[PDB]
Design a protein around this ligand. Structure first.
Ligand SMILES: [Mg+2]
Ligand SMILES: [Mg+2]
Ligand SMILES: [Mg+2]
Ligand SMILES: [Mg+2]
Ligand SMILES: [Mg+2]
Ligand SMILES: [Mg+2]
Ligand SMILES: [Mg+2]
Ligand SMILES: [Mg+2]
Ligand SMILES: [Mg+2]
Ligand SMILES: [Mg+2]
Ligand SMILES: [Mg+2]
Ligand SMILES: [Mg+2]
Ligand SMILES: [Mg+2]
Ligand SMILES: [Mg+2]
Ligand SMILES: [Mg+2]
Ligand SMILES: [Mg+2]
Ligand SMILES: [Mg+2]
Ligand SMILES: [Mg+2]
Ligand SMILES: [Mg+2]
Ligand SMILES: [Mg+2]
Ligand SMILES: [Mg+2]
Ligand SMILES: [Mg+2]
Lengths: 56, 110, 117, 120, 46
RNA sequence: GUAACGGGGCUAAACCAUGCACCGAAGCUGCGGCAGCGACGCUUAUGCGUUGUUGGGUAGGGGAGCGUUCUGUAAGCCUGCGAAGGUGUGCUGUGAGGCAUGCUGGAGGUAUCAGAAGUGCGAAUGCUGACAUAAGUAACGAUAAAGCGGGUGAAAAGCCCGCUCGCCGGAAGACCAAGGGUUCCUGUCCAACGUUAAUCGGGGCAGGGUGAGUCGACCCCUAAGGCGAGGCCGAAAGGCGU
RNA sequence: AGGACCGAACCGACUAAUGUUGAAAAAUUAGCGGAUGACUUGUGGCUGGGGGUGAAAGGCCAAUCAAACCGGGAGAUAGCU
RNA sequence: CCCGGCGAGGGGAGUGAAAAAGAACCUGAAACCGUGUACGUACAAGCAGUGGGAGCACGCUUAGGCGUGUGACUGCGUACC
RNA sequence: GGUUAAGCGACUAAGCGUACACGGUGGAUGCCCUGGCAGUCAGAGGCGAUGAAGGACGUGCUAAUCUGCGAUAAGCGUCGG
């Protein structure tokens, strides 16, 4: 089962109208280190909710 | 003024990079850097390197201030396609296209 | 004497594609489709050069009928009355008067009614 | 349907899952903190925490059960001689999952899972 | 699947080698044709 | 699926008769324009003065042209004060077209009247290249299976180290022949190749590495068979054979 | 003893499923037949295209076979498309 | 010099008449793919045009209105070979 | 002026279209010629057991390839320029 007609660049764009990525709405800010991090994840410098949880 | 950074012949289809590029079009560069930092795409890494290169071009070549810069232009063009053979069943060959893209990021304060 | 036919072929395709602007999709960018669409546009343009005269006469007749019925007479009896009164005003002018000079159109309707009476 | 069912398949057959969580429980016991994938850490809770609970009582039979479940005598020793006493008064919840982002090679969602008292 | 090319250097040289071609009138014609066409490798001879 | 008025609707908005209106085509008329063929008087390179009339068209016949490359005209003319080509725009002709000019371009172009053709593309499941589409879809090649810690790294699910786990174990281990031919080892690099990432590699690059009286080959010897002095045979080529 | 029997290697290929842009231009998996013989296999050799070879299917003769392949006559011819 | 991995790629600087001549290099067309702007488009059925045509946008103009772009709505309209 | 009611109603663009601007891809076009093509005139019409045609290997300050050359090896002697 293959197309009988070449679908248009318009239908291609129409189908891709749902492909847009969602940006992360907002980053959270660690209360201790003040550096931005993904919500409920550890900071890239090992903090989490103001506590240092890992030494990396 | 406007400062450009290009990553030409990036190894990724422009369609994939364009998702990320649309994600940070028109944003302030700090906000764009955050968005790219948390966007789980290979294209986000490439676009982030281009954006950081653009910011450094602006601050160094054009004496801009990072806090003023916005991503005023972030198109992704198609670059040349590398052409490769995928052997398929029954002796058939397909040619796959390893599509490259050119990423252009323009930052400016205006 | 070999002739490279690239320049003239480019020019012909460009002529057609310049005529094909505004057309949807391949019709405005793909020469095969564009040429078909340009030809069909030409046949429509001819056929409709004809169709325009009758569409506009149709519009005028409808407007005259409307105005004449505002003056208590059908279009048919109005046109017959105008002929019997020897008034030779086109449907175009009659409709234009019906819209823009309702008093003069009323006068025309009286003239036709006198002719018919 | 999987109404009310528990336990993640994790795209492994059962004996692979059991082997993997035995190894992962041993890793967590001996290192007290391990990076793994978030679903794997959430399932690892359900194996490690019962091992610690079991080790809160030090009998020969309980060391035998622990050894059956861990197959590592160093892990059993650390469970009964350190972890059991370290969690003697803690009513469950011996681990902590800390989401730590996404693994580069496959974008996998990653978490740290640690013993709760790993600080001291 | 056994495939049709089962290499053997000895059989290759005996069937298409330089000496085999020089052995007959038609082999020498093959060589003459290949020289005239200018081929870098006249024969299978490695 | 109403589905036997095109529909709505209609008791006329049906039917019959009569009558006058009107609508209605690219028919006809009007106005403007072009062309063909006639007939007329002045004549000519026919202009016209007019004047009738004709002008749907496939196969096809006839007539007249546009434009492209090349030759002459041309050691001329245009051209770095910007050629060709490209891309716009404007104007222009009945058309093929033509002219001008903005931008690009950066060195060629070429009137006129002749001359010659690889002289005009949308089709030929045409040919070559490029690029789409399906679509970021299928798939990523045995369902032996991974987990974690440490290292290195810009980055590690995949590399290195470690500890577990699993799988083969008349093999999925080991040594070879054949075949390949540097894939070997070390260093280094990660564009491309690796169906992912790769710091890794049978990838790139460089350097290194193959040591024989006894292993093998060569060699001595013969099989099948080949070739074959002479020879026999065969137009020739050559066949057969001592 | 045996073209004996059961059954691995080895040789095959009866059934089914899968696969059919395959992992694969004939395989995989589960079964299946032969398995001291008219067996099987390595290496080399010989047979050449109206020819070979064939426990015979027009089978096979380099994924090609009611006349191989390559080159040539050759721009065969094509009242057909 | 700068970003970047002592990358790739790029931004400056400089060379040059020219670097949008930078080696993926004269000219750089088309398909094809984007970014920006203008207009339209989420109650509307079909070769996608054509005839009519509102509205908007822009550019001219000394008004006056013309150019342009778009094109709601509407009559007609089933590609080419 | 306020409320209610009724009627009408712009502003949305996930995307998409058309136009335009600017790009990308691509490599057409034009321009170019140390390559071909066809000849004319004229030479020469052979090379080889004094080892040919064609090659293999080697040969440099040389890693490769090409050209040359041949262990006297990008060359040696001599005669001339
Ligand atoms: Mg194959
Ligand atoms: Mg899975
Ligand atoms: Mg009419
Ligand atoms: Mg006619
Ligand atoms: Mg020219
Ligand atoms: Mg045609
Ligand atoms: Mg699909
Ligand atoms: Mg899938
Ligand atoms: Mg695999
Ligand atoms: Mg690790
Ligand atoms: Mg190699
Ligand atoms: Mg190795
Ligand atoms: Mg890769
Ligand atoms: Mg290697
Ligand atoms: Mg010795
Ligand atoms: Mg003899
Ligand atoms: Mg038997
Ligand atoms: Mg058989
Ligand atoms: Mg089987
Ligand atoms: Mg039996
Ligand atoms: Mg025959
Ligand atoms: Mg033919």
């Amino acid at each position: 089962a293959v197309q009988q007609n070449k679908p248009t660049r318009s239908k291609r764009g129409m189908r891709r109208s749902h492909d847009a990525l969602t940006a992360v709405t907002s980053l959270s800010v660690d209360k201790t280190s003040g550096e931005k991090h993904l919500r409920h994840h550890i900071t890239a410098d090992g903090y989490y909710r103001g506590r240092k949880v890992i030494a990396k | 003024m406007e400062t450009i950074a290009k990553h030409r012949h990036a190894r990724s289809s422009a369609q994939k990079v364009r998702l990320v590029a649309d994600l940070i079009r028109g944003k302030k560069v700090s906000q764009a850097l955050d968005i790219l930092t948390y966007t789980n795409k290979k294209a986000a890494v490439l676009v982030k390197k281009v954006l950081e290169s653009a910011i450094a071009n602006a601050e160094h070549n054009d004496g801009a201030d990072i806090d003023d810069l916005k991503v005023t232009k972030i198109f992704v063009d198609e670059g040349p396609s590398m052409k490769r053979i995928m052997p398929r069943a029954k002796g058939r060959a397909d040619r796959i296209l390893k599509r490259t893209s050119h990423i252009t990021v323009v930052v400016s304060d205006r | 004497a070999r002739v490279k036919r690239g320049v003239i072929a480019r020019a012909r395709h460009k002529k057609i594609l310049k005529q094909a602007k505004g057309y949807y999709g391949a019709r405005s960018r793909v020469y095969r489709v564009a040429f078909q669409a340009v030809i069909k546009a030409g046949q429509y343009a001819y056929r409709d050069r004809r169709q325009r005269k009758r569409q506009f006469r149709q519009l005028w007749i409808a407007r005259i009928n409307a105005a004449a019925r505002q003056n208590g007479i059908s279009y048919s009896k109005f046109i017959n009355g105008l002929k019997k009164a020897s008034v030779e005003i086109d449907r175009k002018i009659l409709a234009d008067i019906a819209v823009f000079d309702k008093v003069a159109f009323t006068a025309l309707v009286e003239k036709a009614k006198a002719a018919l009476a | 349907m999987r109404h009310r069912k528990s336990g993640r398949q994790l795209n492994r057959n059962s004996s692979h899952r059991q082997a993997m969580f035995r190894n992962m429980a041993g890793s967590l016991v001996r290192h007290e903190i391990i990076k793994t994938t978030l679903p794997k850490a959430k399932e690892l809770r359900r194996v490690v925490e019962p091992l610690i609970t079991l080790a809160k009582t030090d009998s020969v039979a309980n060391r035998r059960l622990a050894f059956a479940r861990t197959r590592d005598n160093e892990i059993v020793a650390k469970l009964f001689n350190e972890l059991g006493p370290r969690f003697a008064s803690r009513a469950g919840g011996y681990t902590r999952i800390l989401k730590c982002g996404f693994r580069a090679g496959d974008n996998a969602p990653m978490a740290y899972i640690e013993l709760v008292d790993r600080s001291e | 699947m056994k495939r049709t090319f089962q290499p053997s250097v000895l059989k290759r040289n005996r069937s298409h080698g330089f000496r085999a071609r020089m052995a007959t009138k038609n082999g020498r014609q093959v060589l003459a044709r290949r020289r005239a066409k200018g081929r870098a490798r006249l024969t299978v001879s490695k």
